[PDB]
Amino acid sequence: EETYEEFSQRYEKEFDEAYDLFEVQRVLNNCFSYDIVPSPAVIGKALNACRRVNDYATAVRVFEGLKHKVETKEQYDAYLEELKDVREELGIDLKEELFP
Amino acid sequence: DVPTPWGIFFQDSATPNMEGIIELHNNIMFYLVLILTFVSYILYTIIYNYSNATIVHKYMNHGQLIEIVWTTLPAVILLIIAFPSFILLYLCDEVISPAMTIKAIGLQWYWKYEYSDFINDDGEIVEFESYVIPEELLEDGQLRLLDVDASVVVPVDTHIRFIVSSADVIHDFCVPALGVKVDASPGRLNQTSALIQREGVYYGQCSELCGVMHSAMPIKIEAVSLYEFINWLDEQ
Amino acid sequence: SRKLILFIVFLALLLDNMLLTVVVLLFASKATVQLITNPFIGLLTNRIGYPIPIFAGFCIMFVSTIMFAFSSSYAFLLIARSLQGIGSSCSSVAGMGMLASVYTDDEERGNVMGIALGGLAMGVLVGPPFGSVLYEFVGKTAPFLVLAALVLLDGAIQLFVLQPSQKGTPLTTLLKDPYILIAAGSICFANMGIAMLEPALPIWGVAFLPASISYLIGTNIFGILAHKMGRWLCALLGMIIVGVSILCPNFGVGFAIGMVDSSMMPIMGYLVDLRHVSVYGSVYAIADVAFCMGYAIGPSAGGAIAKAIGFPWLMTIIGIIDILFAPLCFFLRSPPAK
Amino acid sequence: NATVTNLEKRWEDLPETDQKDIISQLSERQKLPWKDLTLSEKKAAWYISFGEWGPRRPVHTKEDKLYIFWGTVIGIVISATIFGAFRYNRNVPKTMNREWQAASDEYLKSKNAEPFTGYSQIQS
Amino acid sequence: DVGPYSNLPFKVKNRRVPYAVPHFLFFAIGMGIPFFACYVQLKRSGSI
Amino acid sequence: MRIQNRENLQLFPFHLVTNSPWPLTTSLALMSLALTLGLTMHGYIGNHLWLFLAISLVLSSIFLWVRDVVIEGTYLGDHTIAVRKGLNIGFMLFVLSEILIFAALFWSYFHSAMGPTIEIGCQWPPVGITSIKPTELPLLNTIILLASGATVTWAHHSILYKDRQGTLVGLFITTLLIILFVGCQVLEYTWATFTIADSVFGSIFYAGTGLHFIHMVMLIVMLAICYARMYFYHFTSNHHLGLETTILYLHVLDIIWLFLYIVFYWWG
Amino acid sequence: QFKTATSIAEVEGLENLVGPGAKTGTVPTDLEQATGLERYELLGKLEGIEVFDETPLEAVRKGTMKDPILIDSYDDYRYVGCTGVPADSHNIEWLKPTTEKNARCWECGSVYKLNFL
Amino acid sequence: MNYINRWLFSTNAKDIAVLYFIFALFCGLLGSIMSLILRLELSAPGNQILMGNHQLFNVVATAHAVLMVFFLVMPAAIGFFGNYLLPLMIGASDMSFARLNNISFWLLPPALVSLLASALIENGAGTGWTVYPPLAGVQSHSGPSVDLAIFALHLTSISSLLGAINFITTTLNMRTIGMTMSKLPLFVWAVVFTSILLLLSLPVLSAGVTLLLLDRNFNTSFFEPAGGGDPILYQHLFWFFGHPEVYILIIPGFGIISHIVSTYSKKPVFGAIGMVYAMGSIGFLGLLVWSHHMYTVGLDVDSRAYFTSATMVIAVPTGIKIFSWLATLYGGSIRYTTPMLYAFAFLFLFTVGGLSGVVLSNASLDIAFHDTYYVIGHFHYVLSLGAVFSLFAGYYYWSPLITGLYYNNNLANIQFWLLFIGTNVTFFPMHFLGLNGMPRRIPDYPDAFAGWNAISSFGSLISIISVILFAYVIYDQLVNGLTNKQLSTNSLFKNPDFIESNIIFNDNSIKSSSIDFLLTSPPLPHTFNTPAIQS
Amino acid sequence: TATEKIIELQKFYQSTNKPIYAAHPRSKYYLIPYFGLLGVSVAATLFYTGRACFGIKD
Amino acid sequence: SLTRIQGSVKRRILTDISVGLTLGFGFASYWWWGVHKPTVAHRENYYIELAKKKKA
Ligand code: HEA
Numbered sequence A: 001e002e003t004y005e006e007f008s009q010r011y012e013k014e015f016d017e018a019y020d021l022f023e024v025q026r027v028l029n030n031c032f033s034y035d036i037v038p039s040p041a042v043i044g045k046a047l048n049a050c051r052r053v054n055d056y057a058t059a060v061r062v063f064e065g066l067k068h069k070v071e072t073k074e075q076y077d078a079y080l081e082e083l084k085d086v087r088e089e090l091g092i093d094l095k096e097e098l099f100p
Numbered sequence B: 001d002v003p004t005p006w007g008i009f010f011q012d013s014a015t016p017n018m019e020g021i022i023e024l025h026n027n028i029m030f031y032l033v034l035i036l037t038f039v040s041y042i043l044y045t046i047i048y049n050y051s052n053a054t055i056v057h058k059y060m061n062h063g064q065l066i067e068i069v070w071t072t073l074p075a076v077i078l079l080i081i082a083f084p085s086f087i088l089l090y091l092c093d094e095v096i097s098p099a100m101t102i103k104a105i106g107l108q109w110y111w112k113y114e115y116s117d118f119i120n121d122d123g124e125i126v127e128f129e130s131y132v133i134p135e136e137l138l139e140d141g142q143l144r145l146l147d148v149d150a151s152v153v154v155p156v157d158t159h160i161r162f163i164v165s166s167a168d169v170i171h172d173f174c175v176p177a178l179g180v181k182v183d184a185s186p187g188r189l190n191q192t193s194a195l196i197q198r199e200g201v202y203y204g205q206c207s208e209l210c211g212v213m214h215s216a217m218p219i220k221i222e223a224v225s226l227y228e229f230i231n232w233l234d235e236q
Numbered sequence C: 001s002r003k004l005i006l007f008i009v010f011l012a013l014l015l016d017n018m019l020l021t022v023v024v025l026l027f028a029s030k031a032t033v034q035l036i037t038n039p040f041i042g043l044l045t046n047r048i049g050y051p052i053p054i055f056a057g058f059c060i061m062f063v064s065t066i067m068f069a070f071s072s073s074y075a076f077l078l079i080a081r082s083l084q085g086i087g088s089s090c091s092s093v094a095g096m097g098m099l100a101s102v103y104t105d106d107e108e109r110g111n112v113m114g115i116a117l118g119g120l121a122m123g124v125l126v127g128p129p130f131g132s133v134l135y136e137f138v139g140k141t142a143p144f145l146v147l148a149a150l151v152l153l154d155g156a157i158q159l160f161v162l163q164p165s166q167k168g169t170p171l172t173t174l175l176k177d178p179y180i181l182i183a184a185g186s187i188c189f190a191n192m193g194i195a196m197l198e199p200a201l202p203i204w205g206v207a208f209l210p211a212s213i214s215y216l217i218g219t220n221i222f223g224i225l226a227h228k229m230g231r232w233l234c235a236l237l238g239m240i241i242v243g244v245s246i247l248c249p250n251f252g253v254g255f256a257i258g259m260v261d262s263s264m265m266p267i268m269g270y271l272v273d274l275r276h277v278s279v280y281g282s283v284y285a286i287a288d289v290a291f292c293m294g295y296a297i298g299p300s301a302g303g304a305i306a307k308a309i310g311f312p313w314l315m316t317i318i319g320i321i322d323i324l325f326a327p328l329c330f331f332l333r334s335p336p337a338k
Numbered sequence D: 001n002a003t004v005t006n007l008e009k010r011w012e013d014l015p016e017t018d019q020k021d022i023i024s025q026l027s028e029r030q031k032l033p034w035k036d037l038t039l040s041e042k043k044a045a046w047y048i049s050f051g052e053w054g055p056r057r058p059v060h061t062k063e064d065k066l067y068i069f070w071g072t073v074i075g076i077v078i079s080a081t082i083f084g085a086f087r088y089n090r091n092v093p094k095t096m097n098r099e100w101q102a103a104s105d106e107y108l109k110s111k112n113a114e115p116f117t118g119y120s121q122i123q124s
Numbered sequence E: 001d002v003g004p005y006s007n008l009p010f011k012v013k014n015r016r017v018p019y020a021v022p023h024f025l026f027f028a029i030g031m032g033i034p035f036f037a038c039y040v041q042l043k044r045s046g047s048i
Numbered sequence F: 001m002r003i004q005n006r007e008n009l010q011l012f013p014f015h016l017v018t019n020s021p022w023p024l025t026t027s028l029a030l031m032s033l034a035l036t037l038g039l040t041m042h043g044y045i046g047n048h049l050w051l052f053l054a055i056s057l058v059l060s061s062i063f064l065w066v067r068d069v070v071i072e073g074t075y076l077g078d079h080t081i082a083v084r085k086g087l088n089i090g091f092m093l094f095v096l097s098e099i100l101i102f103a104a105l106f107w108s109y110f111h112s113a114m115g116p117t118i119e120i121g122c123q124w125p126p127v128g129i130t131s132i133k134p135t136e137l138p139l140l141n142t143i144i145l146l147a148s149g150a151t152v153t154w155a156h157h158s159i160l161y162k163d164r165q166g167t168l169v170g171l172f173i174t175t176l177l178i179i180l181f182v183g184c185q186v187l188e189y190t191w192a193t194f195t196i197a198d199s200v201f202g203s204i205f206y207a208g209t210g211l212h213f214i215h216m217v218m219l220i221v222m223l224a225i226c227y228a229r230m231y232f233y234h235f236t237s238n239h240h241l242g243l244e245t246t247i248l249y250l251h252v253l254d255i256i257w258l259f260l261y262i263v264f265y266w267w268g
Numbered sequence G: 001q002f003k004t005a006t007s008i009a010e011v012e013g014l015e016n017l018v019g020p021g022a023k024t025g026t027v028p029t030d031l032e033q034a035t036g037l038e039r040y041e042l043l044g045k046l047e048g049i050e051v052f053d054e055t056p057l058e059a060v061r062k063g064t065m066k067d068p069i070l071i072d073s074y075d076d077y078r079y080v081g082c083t084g085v086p087a088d089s090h091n092i093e094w095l096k097p098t099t100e101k102n103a104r105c106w107e108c109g110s111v112y113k114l115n116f117l
Numbered sequence H: 001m002n003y004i005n006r007w008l009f010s011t012n013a014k015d016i017a018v019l020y021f022i023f024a025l026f027c028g029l030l031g032s033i034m035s036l037i038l039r040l041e042l043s044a045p046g047n048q049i050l051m052g053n054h055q056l057f058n059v060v061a062t063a064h065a066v067l068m069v070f071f072l073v074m075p076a077a078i079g080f081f082g083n084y085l086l087p088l089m090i091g092a093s094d095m096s097f098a099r100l101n102n103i104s105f106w107l108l109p110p111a112l113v114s115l116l117a118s119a120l121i122e123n124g125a126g127t128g129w130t131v132y133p134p135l136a137g138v139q140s141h142s143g144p145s146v147d148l149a150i151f152a153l154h155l156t157s158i159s160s161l162l163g164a165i166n167f168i169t170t171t172l173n174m175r176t177i178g179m180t181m182s183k184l185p186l187f188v189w190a191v192v193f194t195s196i197l198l199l200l201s202l203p204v205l206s207a208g209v210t211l212l213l214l215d216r217n218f219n220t221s222f223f224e225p226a227g228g229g230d231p232i233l234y235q236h237l238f239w240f241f242g243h244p245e246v247y248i249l250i251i252p253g254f255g256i257i258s259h260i261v262s263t264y265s266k267k268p269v270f271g272a273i274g275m276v277y278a279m280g281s282i283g284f285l286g287l288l289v290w291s292h293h294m295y296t297v298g299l300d301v302d303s304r305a306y307f308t309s310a311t312m313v314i315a316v317p318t319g320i321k322i323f324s325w326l327a328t329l330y331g332g333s334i335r336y337t338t339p340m341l342y343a344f345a346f347l348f349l350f351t352v353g354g355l356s357g358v359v360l361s362n363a364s365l366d367i368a369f370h371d372t373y374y375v376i377g378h379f380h381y382v383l384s385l386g387a388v389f390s391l392f393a394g395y396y397y398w399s400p401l402i403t404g405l406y407y408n409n410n411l412a413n414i415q416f417w418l419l420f421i422g423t424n425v426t427f428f429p430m431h432f433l434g435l436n437g438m439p440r441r442i443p444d445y446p447d448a449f450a451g452w453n454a455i456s457s458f459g460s461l462i463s464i465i466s467v468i469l470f471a472y473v474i475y476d477q478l479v480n481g482l483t484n485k486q487l488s489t490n491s492l493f494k495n496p497d498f499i500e501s502n503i504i505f506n507d508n509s510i511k512s513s514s515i516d517f518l519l520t521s522p523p524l525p526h527t528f529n530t531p532a533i534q535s
Numbered sequence I: 001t002a003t004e005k006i007i008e009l010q011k012f013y014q015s016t017n018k019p020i021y022a023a024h025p026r027s028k029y030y031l032i033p034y035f036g037l038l039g040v041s042v043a044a045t046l047f048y049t050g051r052a053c054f055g056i057k058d
Numbered sequence J: 001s002l003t004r005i006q007g008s009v010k011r012r013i014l015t016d017i018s019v020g021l022t023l024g025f026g027f028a029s030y031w032w033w034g035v036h037k038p039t040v041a042h043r044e045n046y047y048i049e050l051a052k053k054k055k056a
């Protein structure tokens, strides 16, 4: 029943008040559990939340979740072309550039 | 008729009632096949798409339109199945003019047959008893556990009304090709009817359990022409 | 055949009381509606016959409940109750007439009337919250609706697809005969007592539950018992038991109600056959009017009396009248020559 | 560098007291602004949290499906052998012979039996 | 004495006779009882 | 839960029953009874002194259960408000199954009543079997049961208003007035002109009016226990769960009798 | 067996709950014949104190690691069932708070701490 | 003496479930071997193993029916899984009436002795599972054999009645702080519904069997037509118990599957209220239909229509349950452990077996399928593949929580595949043999029916190998069971989510929707001292 | 003492150290005959059910 | 645009119900026009050649 523009505000508000790594992982886990793929603003707040709690693996796995949530590949490449300044400023590296 | 070695489906029919049974069964299997294919496809899709999945949809738990739809369609299927069943149940029976009567008393481990007509003034009603031919005394070509020393003989294209009763325990009168299956209770008279369209030999077996030699009580019904029936009756 | 005719009466008689409990007051409205339209059915039954109205009533009820689902307005709910009561009245009258027609012999009629009236009690328990706001109740009631549809389809196949005068003694003239008045009024008093008892009792539903089973048992047994025992004697005991219970527990009231109903319903056709025209359809209208009028008018008066003169005094007056109704019922033993 | 380089081939053999030291040495190295972390540290940090060790192992490996398959085949062979052993030692009545099941066909052919799909009693 | 071997009616470890004997005899008796009845009834009626 | 010394007492209102050997003994007695009864009817025993021993042992087993169930409630003091409600639910659920066995016999009676076999002449109670007149002793039994139901309500209202003499007289009269029911129905089995094996009528008449007999002997034993336990100061003015259970049983038996008297004695 | 109690402030066990005796010729009262966990309840209900609480869990606020919801337990552990802040939103999740670690409720995030009495 | 006061004079509810399990294994092994004896005689035409005795073939069938309907499924499903799980799910330390539970256990071994002694004292009791009156008289069965078999159905009835009454009275007034009767799990609802059916269905059976005993031993003439009786009455008094019975064996199974589909598919059950209402309707409409077992006895033409209409309506609630299970497995993640395999195999085999039911409910068609192996093939798919599969799933699901010891995954998978293949080979040709006209309860058959009978005696020898492997699996569980938890990740109750790191998972491992998986590794004897709290 | 031994048997059943069915000094008379006769009854139903499997009658 | 995805499981459900019913109807329209009707036609052709022999 909830709309896109209420989902995408409730989750920014939730990401802006988490205090531990447990909380960030919990909020991310049920953000990717709806019918709606999160907008780039929500992911932008999620990366900052992961930065405050000082975790690197989560910032790389948030991008690995988009590859599965998205329907096709053009959409996945469209996400990576709006979240490009944020990545190159924070320092996040995708998994396919690490090959771990 | 006679059972076939590697059987898969019904026996050949010789009465309208058995054709009705076959048609109703073939009608129901349509919808049953539909339901089975639907369920199997859903399981196949679930296995192929959603095994070891990264995303879990843990908020799709209510449904409102789909619960009407998996409750109304089975109802309409049941109604469609129920219509022809009621028509067949009420329609096919001995509506007009039964033509001949044969009493079949089922004793312990053999059958007894009486022809209620064909009587004289002194009570010489034609009657006999049907036993089973053992393995040791079989001739060349006779079927085992289905062949009897005396066989019922009836005309073709004549209504036959069988009255079933028993004297010892609860037996069952069965002839699968003719579509006849009735019980023989110790203190009541049951009845069934049959019409035969082609000449031949029809074999049958008992149904309800009655003791040691429950597997050795064959029934054998021959359908001959009118002339042969007269010749047979003028000898017994 | 004959058994099928009974199943239909069971369903029809169950439906009306199932709707009574459901509400969604509105029931008060439904009952008056029934009184108003019941008399007319005597003309219809005699000419067209029962089977055409019988199945039409069910589809009218279905469209009425569809109207319930469509519109939530109070006026629409009242109109739906009115149409629902119209269909219920037509179905009940036609079913009683047809079941009377099929079973000519008196004893068979007494046997079948109990099983028919059993649905009247069954409707009370089956559908009190029938089709509630939550979809789960609709889902739970779906299987029974399917069974009703299949049995009605069997009836349709039997009656239609396959091969299966004037009334005298008007209603007021019929009342002029004292036996008719006594027999009709005994049921009305018996129902009126319990109907007034029910609302005030909780202040002074769970208790009424055993009465549902008690009514079923009594109606089943006394239909067979009455012919051998004597129909008037069962009513004479039952009315006095109802008066004793009401004046001063639910199971006993229900069992005595079963006594009175099974004793009084079949006996009416006997008087009509003996001293009047050989017509079954018209007579049941008086009884049905008594049933509906007892519950429609009087529960409000009983509630108003309660807490004004007190629940014990209202129950005392109702029990007094019910106990005094017993001497009148003795006259129902034999009717005069005519 | 040796402590962190190539954790994928050594991580599960260490005790439970040499793992908390690595985890608590990478927890005060991530507080620094990233782009100051070596590549090996990034790979090790990814492996420790989201990798194929411990509670992320698969239920079935490639060497377990073969075991299950070759177990079921062996289970079928034993039953086949026992059934054959019980099958050679039988009571064969006189009717189970072809020369007898050819005469029954003649009898069932004189009286027209199964004009539809078929009559035949030959199974030897 | 709560533990992983404290709710069972039988002893499984630190035992003189190894557990395999008690485990196997149970199944052997359970699957061999139905043949004894057949033997008793066959020998009571002549046939072998 | 913030009372001062609360850990010294239990933290939930239920009963943790101690270890008892009575289930095993009752089971063994029932096994012995079943085997002895199954053999004695076809030879294999001869003497009839083993079946009686088995029945005696079973009854002793129930009595020795009830001793502990009484000591756990009158002396140790473990019957809170929850345990009492549980016991009431259990007794009602047993009485329901006790009633449902009678519906089976009533159905077996109406199935033979309507549709009589050709072997018997098409008539209930047939020729040669004279029924029992219902204007005789079966009238006394109904009056006695109604009076018995009326006298035990005087005992339960004589214990809430705190009168001792007035609770004992009612129980005495009720016991001595059910003994008359048993006697009047045991001297009506000796004045009969039809046996168990003369028809289907005499095989159902003595199978629904013989089980009621056993359930009345049970009532006599129960009321004897209630009198003996009230004489010795076991019952309080607000805690007596034997009286309620023995009152709910008498009313059920009376209602069953009023159906065994309308369906078996009158209709025929 | 020992001194008899008069209110639930001098009841230290099952030894203080025997009671005086009735008099010969009267129907005894529950205040003169009650021993175990019956007379405890009887004494509690004559003052207003309920010995056996039946009040469900708190559903007013969530719990942070600085201000956790406190659960009283006479043991080292207690089972707690969480259903949400407005009290029926979150589905049921069961937890075991103890004296060495806190529960955290993987869905909503409320934290429960154990208070030993 | 500590042994005797703890495993003979017992009161704890979780120490009686273990004894029920040990009894069920024994009484299931016996019946399975009797079935093998049955299938080694119907292999090729002639007299093969039982030399010429057609008695001793009916005794085997009757004993196989009784030992495996009354002594395996009920003790395993209402005794082992009810007594152990219902109190822990509802937060009760023990049940309301402990001594009654103890007697409910102990009445059974006295009952198996009678059944085993009715097969050795004389020719035996070859009357079938349904003991029909005119055959089980004193003219065909003259001996202490039928009587000793009726006394084994009396004791079991007492046990079941006491257990059901205990369950109903415990689930009402013995719940935790905040559990209302709409927040209960589904297994508790299943136990409650089966208990209500047990209360309303058993006294009729007791009346019928006792009347038959009186007719046998005291010449009462209830079922003798020379005094005014009818045998058909007995049939009624049997089948009023007969049809509720067949649901008591499947309803406790249903609940088990629900739990499994909510664990390994990490999603809540789709429409819980819908499923509770569906079970209620399935139970209630199971008492109004009992005469489709007698369509050939000569019923009216207006009573067949009601019974053919009231039998098909049951398909609606069961369809609701099946569709809800597919819906709950749809969106979520699936990991194929050994219980989930049985859960998957249940959903297809039960459907295939129950779709045969809608063909046999028509009174017109039952003239061609009554007393024929179509019925046998019908009810083995719903019993041997619907109830036993649920039992195996429950064992593989709850054994580590009770015992503290884990099992080998590979041998479990091997056993599952063997049982699947054997059971599917053994019961499908019965449909063809039924269509071609093979009667039931016959030791010997004509020559035509040989071929399929040679295929159905091949799967039985696979099912028995599966049973022996199950025995070895239990053995490998008990010995070296503590070192089996590191072989496979099947020991884990729930895998980590996508973002949930391993370090965080190791600190918070159990995320559950019931108390069951939070209790200690073997649950403590007194589990709840201070009560549990629910919102 | 007087008829109210209730306040004296309530101090004996508590702190007894024996099972409640063998605590009072009267349980001997109930418990010796019962267990004595149960043994004979059980040892006579096993002598005749193994004596009946061999076909011996009386 | 390409950065706004809202509903993709509902379409999957609709496509997985629109293929499990067409497939079932295909598998059931073979049972009634390839296994049933020709058998009835064969039977009726048999019975109308048996009557011609008797007529002649
Ligand atoms: C324990 C297993 C079990 C169960 C659950 C049931 C329940 C049912 N049984 Fe029962 N039955 C037996 C085992 C069982 N039965 C046995 C052993 C006997 C005889 C024993 C004896 O004779 O000695 C018997 C008796 C019996 C008979 C008597 C046959 C005869 O002898 O002539 C018949 C049919 O006539 C029948 C059919 C059914 C049906 C339709 C159901 C239904 O409850 C099942 C319905 C299942 C479904 C409908 C499948 C799910 C549906 C969908 C997935 C979608 C919905 C589909 C539509 C709406 C069409 N059963």
Ligand code: CUA
Residues within 6 Å of the ligand: B108, B109, B171, B172, B206, B207, B208, B209, B210, B211, B213, B214, B217
């Ligand atoms: Cu005898 Cu069948």
Ligand SMILES: [Cu+2]
Residues within 6 Å of the ligand: H242, H243, H246, H293
């Ligand atoms: Cu059934």
Ligand SMILES: [Zn+2]
Residues within 6 Å of the ligand: G082, G083, G084, G090, G093, G105, G107, G108, G109, G110
């Ligand atoms: Zn929560």
